[PDB]
Specification:
Layout lengths: L32 H16 L9 H6 L15 H11 L34 E2 L5 E5 L7 H15 L2 E5 L14 E2 L9 E12 L5 E8 L11 E5 L13 E5 L1 E2 L5
Parallel strand pairs: 4-7
Antiparallel strand pairs: 1-9, 2-8, 3-5, 3-8, 5-6, 6-7
Bound molecules: dihydrogenphosphate ion (2 copies) and potassium ion.
Subcellular location: Secreted
Subunit structure: Monomer. Interacts with kinase CPK1/CDPK1 at the schizont stage.
Protein name: p50
């Protein structure tokens, strides 16, 4: 029965889980997947510490940053910057306080109002970079260990951040109802989250396994905004579909 063990993890099937209540979002026509995937990883980390499934304001992160003005719609950033933004501001408003519209990416950072809730209240970034990252290509000859690392973090933190090449999921007949059997590229350009996994039997009757991946292209794309992808992919791939994974090292007290 249980919804997240070492062989099978799918919290989406449990309407009672905090994580299942974090609805899929749409980044729109800006390069802001770095914000969606990073804030979702924090949102699941919060769920695991007993907090409400309250959405972080992606627009606040897009619009509030130190230094010279940047083109926050045309230029993607990284999860390292999500953390840099937290550490500079110490405030993450709820989505409801400052809701996302992609055409507003670029607006002046809004003044925090008294009635805004702080979704990072009492949060600490652990020492020494604040995150841990892994490259699939560095595990080409111990893919098992890579899989194990990701499974453990999905179990414990509720998700990891993963980087993929967006083109790899733009196959002309991409169907969210199928486990995709995909290759990756030498590089990546789009942040997603791995949120679960399980085993399946493929079209050749072979035992295989899949990641469940959350995207930020709205709930119409894929399978209600998610898709399944084979952990290994075609034998011939030089590069795994999952290029990199990033995990945040955050200390949040058990509360709310
Ligand atoms: O968020 P993206 O469009 O820079 O992959
Ligand atoms: O498409 P490849 O570069 O993963 O073989
Ligand atoms: K490729």
């Amino acid at each position: 029965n249980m919804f997240c063990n070492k062989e099978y993890c799918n919290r989406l099937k449990d309407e009672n889980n905090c994580i299942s209540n974090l609805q899929v979002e749409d980044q729109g026509n800006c390069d802001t997947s770095w914000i969606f995937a990073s804030k979702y990883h924090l949102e699941t980390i919060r769920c695991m510490k007993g907090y409400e499934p309250t959405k972080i304001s992606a627009l606040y992160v897009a619009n509030c940053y130190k230094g010279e003005h940047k083109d926050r719609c045309d230029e993607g950033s990284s999860p390292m910057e999500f953390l840099q933004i937290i550490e500079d501001y110490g405030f993450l408003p709820a989505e409801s306080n400052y809701p996302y519209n992609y055409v507003k990416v670029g607006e002046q950072c809004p003044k925090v109002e008294d009635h805004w809730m702080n979704l990072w209240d009492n949060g600490k970034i652990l020492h020494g970079k604040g995150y841990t990252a892994y490259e699939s290509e560095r595990f080409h000859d111990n893919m098992d260990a890579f899989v194990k690392i990701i499974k453990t973090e999905v179990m414990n933190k509720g998700s990891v951040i993963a980087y993929i090449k967006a083109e790899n999921v733009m196959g002309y007949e991409f169907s969210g109802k199928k486990v995709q059997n995909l290759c990756g590229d030498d590089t990546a350009d789009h942040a997603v989250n791995i949120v679960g996994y399980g085993n399946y039997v493929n079209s050749e009757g072979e035992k295989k396994s899949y990641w469940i991946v959350r995207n930020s292209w709205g709930p119409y794309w894929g399978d209600e905004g998610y898709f399944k992808v084979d952990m290994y992919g075609p034998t011939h791939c030089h590069f795994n579909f999952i290029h990199s994974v990033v995990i945040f090292n955050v200390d949040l007290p058990m509360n709310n």
